[PDB]
Amino acid sequence: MPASTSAAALQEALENAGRLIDRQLQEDRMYPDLSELLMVSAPNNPTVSGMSDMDYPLQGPGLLSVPNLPEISSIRRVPLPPELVEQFGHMQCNCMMGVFPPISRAWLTIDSDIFMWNYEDGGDLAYFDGLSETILAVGLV
Amino acid sequence: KKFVLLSAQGSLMFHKLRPVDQLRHLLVSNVGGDGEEIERFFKLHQEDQACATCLILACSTAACDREVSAWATRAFFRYGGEAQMRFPEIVYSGKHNGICIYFSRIMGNIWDASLVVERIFKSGNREITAIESSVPCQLLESVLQELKGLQEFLDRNSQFAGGPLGNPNTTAKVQQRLIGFMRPENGNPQQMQQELQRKFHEAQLSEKISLQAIQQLVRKSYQALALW
Amino acid sequence: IQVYDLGQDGQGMSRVASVSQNAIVSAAGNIARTIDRSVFKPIVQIAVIENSESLDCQLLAVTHAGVRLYFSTCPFRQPLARPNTLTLVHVRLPPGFSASSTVEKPSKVHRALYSKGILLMAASENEDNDILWCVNHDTFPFQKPMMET
Amino acid sequence: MLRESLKEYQKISNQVDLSNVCAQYRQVRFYEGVVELSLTAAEKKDPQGLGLHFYKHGEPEEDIVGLQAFQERLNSYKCITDTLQELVNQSKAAPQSPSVPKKPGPPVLSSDPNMLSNEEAGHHFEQMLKLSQRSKDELFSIALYNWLIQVDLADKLLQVASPFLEPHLVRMAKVDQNRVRYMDLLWRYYEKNRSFSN
């Protein structure tokens, strides 16, 4: 064989592969807006769903099912730390508890005071006492 | 995707499972790449997307996936179909389509991009045009991991491309379906069966040529991104 | 529920819209015409639908009875528009609202969380205990109408 | 108001969601009403003693009625033992294998208001145990003995001066496959009670 016809057939085959990748990447990029998943054709033509067993397909035998399939991980409980479970003996008027994800800390308030710790391991426990009035709201910025 | 709930008892830490973590759960519950729950997963996601989901676990270098890779490889080769003529069009198997889907996803943000962007820096009373990469170094690096995993998966398993490694007691259940739909009057059933067997090899040959073209395309992408 | 424009720069400020719960409950029951008008209130949560999640829809609201109330503030498929309404564009009831469901219904729902299709809800069982509900389309993502695990 | 709430639940105890009420008592630390209401919810299920007759004659497979009475007394007593278990699993968690998973435990330690969670959990355990130790129910006493063995509280089984304990060990040392552990509890019972020749 001349080397030109095997080189040409390999170059055509590399495009015939690439033009199948162009298909599958266009198929993944044809993902719908949530408006069409929810079947809404205009904002002045509002619609409903959640009214058939096909909205929320049951794991039943003979349906599109794997029975017992998990949607969430097992729930790894982790804690409020021991300094803090003491202070529930001292609370009088207000309590507020929350999370700030972009710092890896939870937070708790008791009346005038605020406490913070790592929600994944109870570590890096700290507090702040620089107040003399009840905390009504907290926010990270 | 990660989540946290708080109660008076402390933190309740959890995640939303991906289809690949659902597959990783089933490969562990069946202690292998076979068992009927994996054969239900292939019917839920369909063969091609179940194969693309198997390829992540099959390519994984992670020390905790080290047998799950052999289990996902077993599930992929077993359950993702075989090359067929539609009547006509050649339909590749969910194994071939799943390789195409996994490569289109590895390349998803880059495949049609220019690999450069031109930018203008303002050095006081001078504007200065310069050319940089469009792709960040860590995005080249992470795409190169999954693509080297896919290159090795295709090279390691290259001998099985076009091999019908099924249990023979499946085959009759396929043959029994097509016979229900044909009545060419005066048509010889031996010549029908002989051309149907020809067209099965015609599809398997097309799939093998297509797989071995994709194998060389994966290699050209890996070397191009590693040079970049 | 109220809507404000922060400016296209995120430095401006104006109030665009305000819509009261009894108007939302009226609109929802004028869409889901076989459903009672209790399950549309109280609205216990709002959540933003990112411009990574929809161009046609921009806000979700959730009720104590798990009802998802999807809203639009712009014209559909004009992703460079500024907000000019707060239109209720879709009602989605939770599980159990089929006529043949053997699965139960979210009720008491006191916290809800939503971000890219996935809904999480807390709902008290007795008064000691909560049930965490999870609902999503990750298993059927391209499908019309939307199917959920 | 808790000793008032307790009496109105004690009227109707046959029909009460005892698990929910005793969990709702735990969220107010009313372990007293967890002992009392769970006994009044066994007492009124078997007002004839069939679950104790069943046990005394041999736990036999033909007495489906005494077997049902025995089980429904045990189901009511369980609101006591799951609560004693909660207090042991809050207190022993710092010495060994902490609750609320992976490694860092659920109470900072190192400074306190003279009582915290492990010490409160140990105090409320000893106070609730010293309420359970006032029952006249022999089948509850047997269920409490089996729970004290299943949580490795043998020294505190060997703190129950009760006539039901010797006949119970003198049953188990003929019936349980861990026969040796009941002979081991029985010589430690006899020696501590100065019955040295036994």
UniProtKB/Swiss-Prot annotation, chain A:
Disease named in the record: Atrial fibrillation, familial, 15: A familial form of atrial fibrillation, a common sustained cardiac rhythm disturbance. Atrial fibrillation is characterized by disorganized atrial electrical activity and ineffective atrial contraction promoting blood stasis in the atria and reduces ventricular filling. It can result in palpitations, syncope, thromboembolic stroke, and congestive heart failure.
The species this protein belongs to is: Homo sapiens (Human)
Q: In which tissues is it expressed?
A: Expressed in all tissues tested, including heart, brain, placenta, lung, liver, skeletal muscle, kidney and pancreas.
What's the protein here called? Nuclear pore complex protein Nup155
Described by its record, this protein's role is as follows:
Essential component of nuclear pore complex. Could be essessential for embryogenesis. Nucleoporins may be involved both in binding and translocating proteins during nucleocytoplasmic transport.
Domain of life where this protein originates: Eukaryota
Q: Which gene encodes it?
A: NUP155
Subcellular location(s) per record: Nucleus, Nuclear pore complex; Nucleus membrane
Q: Which family does it belong to?
A: Belongs to the non-repetitive/WGA-negative nucleoporin family.
Q: How is it modified after translation?
A: Phosphorylated. Phosphorylation and dephosphorylation may be important for the function of NUP155 and may play a role in the reversible disassembly of the nuclear pore complex during mitosis.
This protein's assembly is summarised as: Interacts with GLE1. Able to form a heterotrimer with GLE1 and NUP42 in vitro. Forms a complex with NUP35, NUP93, NUP205 and lamin B.
Curated annotation (Swiss-Prot), chain D:
Provide the record's note on post-translational modification: Phosphorylated. Phosphorylation and dephosphorylation may be important for the function of NUP155 and may play a role in the reversible disassembly of the nuclear pore complex during mitosis.
Could you identify this protein by its name? Nuclear pore complex protein Nup155
Top-rank lineage group of the source organism = Eukaryota
Q: How does it assemble?
A: Interacts with GLE1. Able to form a heterotrimer with GLE1 and NUP42 in vitro. Forms a complex with NUP35, NUP93, NUP205 and lamin B.
Name the gene that codes for it.
NUP155
Similarity field = Belongs to the non-repetitive/WGA-negative nucleoporin family.
Give from-to of the shown chain within the full protein: 896 to 1093 of 1391
Annotated function: Essential component of nuclear pore complex. Could be essessential for embryogenesis. Nucleoporins may be involved both in binding and translocating proteins during nucleocytoplasmic transport.
Q: Where in the cell is it found?
A: Nucleus, Nuclear pore complex; Nucleus membrane
Expressed, tissue-wise, as follows:
Expressed in all tissues tested, including heart, brain, placenta, lung, liver, skeletal muscle, kidney and pancreas.
Residues bearing the modification Phosphoserine: S162
Task: Name the associated disease, please.
Answer: Atrial fibrillation, familial, 15: A familial form of atrial fibrillation, a common sustained cardiac rhythm disturbance. Atrial fibrillation is characterized by disorganized atrial electrical activity and ineffective atrial contraction promoting blood stasis in the atria and reduces ventricular filling. It can result in palpitations, syncope, thromboembolic stroke, and congestive heart failure.
Q: Where is this region: Disordered?
A: 90-117
